[PDB]
């Protein structure tokens, strides 16, 4: 089926998982994560295999798959 689940790991090793489509712009994940952490989205950088995830990157563009990890670091 079409949602994949991505694991977002915080600096404190906490995890929030997100269900997204392959075509979803990951800005929406970044905004949801920042909201739930209580911090401004622009205070964070989101990385996939160490590379910065842009607002308009999609899982398809980045080659993401079910249960791939995103790491969040301070900007």
């Amino acid at each position: 089926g079409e949602y994949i689940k991505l694991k977002v790991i915080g600096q404190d090793s906490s995890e929030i998982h997100f269900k997204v489509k392959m075509t979803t712009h990951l800005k929406k994940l970044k905004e949801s994560y920042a909201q739930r952490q209580g911090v401004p989205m622009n205070s964070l950088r989101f990385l996939f295999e160490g590379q910065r995830i842009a607002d308009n990157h999609t899982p398809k563009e980045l080659g993401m798959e079910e249960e791939d990890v995103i790491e969040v670091y301070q900007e």
Partner: peptide, 17 residues
Amino acid sequence: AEERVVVISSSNSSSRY
């Protein structure tokens, strides 16, 4: 911590404001 899964949602004539 418990598992947390968030579903990200997709990307007028009823309006009054």
